[PDB]
Amino acid sequence: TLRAAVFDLDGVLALPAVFGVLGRTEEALALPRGLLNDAFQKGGPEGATTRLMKGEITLSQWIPLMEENCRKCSETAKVCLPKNFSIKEIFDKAISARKINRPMLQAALMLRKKGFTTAILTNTWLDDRAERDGLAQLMCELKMHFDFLIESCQVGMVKPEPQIYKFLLDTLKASPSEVVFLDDIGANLKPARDLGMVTILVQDTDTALKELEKVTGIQLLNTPAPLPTSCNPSDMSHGYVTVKPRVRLHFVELGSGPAVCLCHGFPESWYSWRYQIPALAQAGYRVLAMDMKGYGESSAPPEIEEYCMEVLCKEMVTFLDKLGLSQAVFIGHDWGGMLVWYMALFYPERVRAVASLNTPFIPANPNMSPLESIKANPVFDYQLYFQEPGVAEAELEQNLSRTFKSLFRASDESVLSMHKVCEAGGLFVNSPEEPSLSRMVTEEEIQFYVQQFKKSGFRGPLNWYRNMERNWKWACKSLGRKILIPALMVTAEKDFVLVPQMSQHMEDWIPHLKRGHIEDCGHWTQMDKPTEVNQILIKWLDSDAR
Amino acid sequence: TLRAAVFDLDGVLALPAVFGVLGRTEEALALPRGLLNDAFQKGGPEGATTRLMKGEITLSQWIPLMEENCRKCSETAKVCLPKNFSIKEIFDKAISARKINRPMLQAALMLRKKGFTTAILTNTWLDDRAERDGLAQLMCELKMHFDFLIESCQVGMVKPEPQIYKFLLDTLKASPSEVVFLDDIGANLKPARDLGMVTILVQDTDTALKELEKVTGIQLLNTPAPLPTSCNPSDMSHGYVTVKPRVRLHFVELGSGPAVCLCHGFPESWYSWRYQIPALAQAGYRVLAMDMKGYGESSAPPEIEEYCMEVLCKEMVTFLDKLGLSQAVFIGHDWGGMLVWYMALFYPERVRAVASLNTPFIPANPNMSPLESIKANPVFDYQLYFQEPGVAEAELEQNLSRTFKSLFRASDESVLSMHKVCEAGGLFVNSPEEPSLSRMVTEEEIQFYVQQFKKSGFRGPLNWYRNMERNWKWACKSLGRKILIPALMVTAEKDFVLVPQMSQHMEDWIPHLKRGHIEDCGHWTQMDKPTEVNQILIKWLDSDAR
Ligand SMILES: Ic1ccc2[nH]ncc2c1
Ligand SMILES: Ic1ccc2[nH]ncc2c1
User: Fold this and answer.
1) Where would I find the beta strands (DSSP E) of B187-267?
2) What class is the A1-16+97-217 domain?
3) B334 classed as catalytic
4) In this complex, which of A128, A137, A156 lies closest to B485 when CB atoms are compared?
5) What is the CATH number that goes with domain A17-96?
6) I need a labelling partner for B316 at 20 to 30 A (CA). Which of A205, B17, B439, B539 fits?
């Protein structure tokens, strides 16, 4: 009975296999058949390539030895290689051309999701080439999805030597009959079979996945489109910056490249961006996913004025100052989307680019009090319910699990009217005491939000809505400005509060505005449509954020 | 009696002044004298430039209005500007050419060091130009050194309006006679004088600094070369990554660009790099200054095996994995320098470049036990004293203040023999109970190390020396390798343990090795010679680390 799956790298998790490309080179070069593949394999266990794979020597040391094998193979062949022949060029090009076999990785992902222990077992080298980062990046992306990565050059043993298979078994804490072993090399597959392991010879991926599906009894082929990679909170780098004597800001950080500062809405967390963080880091960006002031591990002072846009924006500037960042791309959702527009208007020199999910940019009306403005729109009634200190805190804090379960739902499954909230006397007045679980979230994810909110509750978060007059007075100073830095407005078709139509006049104030639109998407954009959000943000970032 | 100093930005803290460059442009272009300076100043308080400086409009909105003023000034002048005339080009070029007036900043730094409250008061704009980052970076570098930064476009008032001076006074919490105000503009200087503030009209810096020195009674001109910027621990971004169930690694993070991972030695801290962190971040790098395992806020498990090089290196790889970093430049000192060479040998794909201060790279002798090797050199006797669990912990933990004060000393002032340590029965056996303070450190800095070491003591740190056999066996597997990635060896002339001569054969194993050498430098390289360390590292990083 299987509980472990082992995958080779070359020709299994990454395509294409070496022997094929060495073959391709022989042909492109009109060289005698198999000469390159032959010099590569020269001396077998005692040869230069085995020493490389065992970690005795580096890739740069192996290059001249492979060169010497090529000449000697050519000498016996009664052949002469040209004067433009480079092993370095051939190998640089081949390593660079090799990409993750996405459907193979998906099957490994599904197996692990079903409780399998997964591992990569590979005959690899110690790469010290000037271009080593390309391979480093590939191994980084691949390895995160597996329980174990066993590299021949690290353990000093190679396939097909029996000890590596015994090493693999000892690592897995499994007896061989509990293991599926996938390899594209028949010779490297035999020792695993000898031990009684289930083996799959990998030629074309589809056939290999059909065999894998049959042996495991788990659907791997033709499955629905998977969700993007999420975040395990305990596996993240957690950062903390004191922005002022009583205020510290917490954030989760992943990746390298231009800083992308993610600003959640109400009543959320850095964790609301769980589906965006790995994708954006994988796309070549340094992600800083904030716990906004009043939330999670960030400070939550009680004073209402601590949460006006002017103070919040000033603190975000100090946050960048303390981190040594002259700029960051600012991406916000809901209340975070509002902050992000104000960061663009007031601190454009610190904003590389600005993007908002659902939250439109609407200039302050200097001829109408913000309270009058909110009253004009029936859907903003919940904002009035939030005004009175203590009222919404008591309802929202009564049962945290009910709060997040009632709030976090797709457009298809709501239990909340958002209609005449004050008149009804609550957000959850006609809501079940034990709401069902939305298709959007797992119980574990609800529990994370529950645990986060146990620290400071809803006072600081609700305070974000309690500065309408102060925010209005400050926003009025920006009335003659326009947003001329790169900007993206992302609307959600089924957000019944932050309706797409509310963003319709944005081009009057952001003339070069770029747009994204998500169909059949509710208010909780990031978890509702993670794949689409990722696609829109990465595409916009690569074209406009540099 | 003075206690506050205020500096203008344009023509005071940054050079050169606008009126001069607008003048320069008129001349280069053969334009009627003062036309550009005139169109710039058009409409005075009611004009386009005042609105820009008050924050009513952005720089990109102001450009076409300045263009329209230029034409109208030319029309009256009976002049026609050419068809290649660009306000954007002129202003982009001028902003870019403007640099920090280093001697003015030094005087502001000295005044603040002497207890003055310092501030920058500037008539500036909201920059939304594609090239805004150049200015953002300059303001970031400048602002960190001051108590206050008052920007006209942020406060909605400009010099020479009296309210800005009253705003400045209210910010300073000072009466005008307590303030020196430096400005290059006579008109902007008068309101401050009217209030009774001490004023300095700034033309050439030297004369301005002579006047400043006279009025304050503090030496600002001809002073000794200052130390590089240090770190205030409470003002840093603190990061935490769990590398395994029982191990968490703490680090301080500053800057943007390629990741540079700083690895301290024994018995140190991330704080040992305090003089390097701001400089390296300012040089265009993302600094990650570690608390190595066993130190400060990082975990300190008791087991000896937790501190062998193999485990330490594996954890540093996981640290990069968890942060989403495919590579980092690794810079180490003492025990950190040793780890950094092993990172290069075992994980070259993860090492962008490698640099070591004092610690040479010496391949393991497979024919001699590491204990035999250590015994062969009299200076390594302290390492034998460190072998026995509990002995060195008791002496080093008896009085923390005495420990760091006795250890952290320049080559000129040592109290420690490091000679026949075991025979003497201790490191501090012939050392004063109340050591004097080294010229290298302040009492506050000693206290920081004291506080850090109160958490875990010396067990985990001393454990770094307790894996000689394990490290030797592992290092022997790398005997056929060479270091072919970019590498720097920095020797310290007066390090009497890690003597420069010990690094003499390094080129045999690192053929492309680059070098640095610091004269009159002891063991505590970073704090002994911070300016020289910074110069060597930045120069090497820019040429070899990208
Ligand atoms: I609180 C909150 C805010 C906006 C919303 N839009 N749709 C649901 C919903 C809940
Ligand atoms: I602990 C230690 C290690 C090396 C040294 N070199 N010079 C002083 C000194 C102290």
Assistant:
1) 198-201, 237-244, 247-254, 259-263
2) alpha beta
3) yes
4) A128
5) 1.10.150.240
6) B539
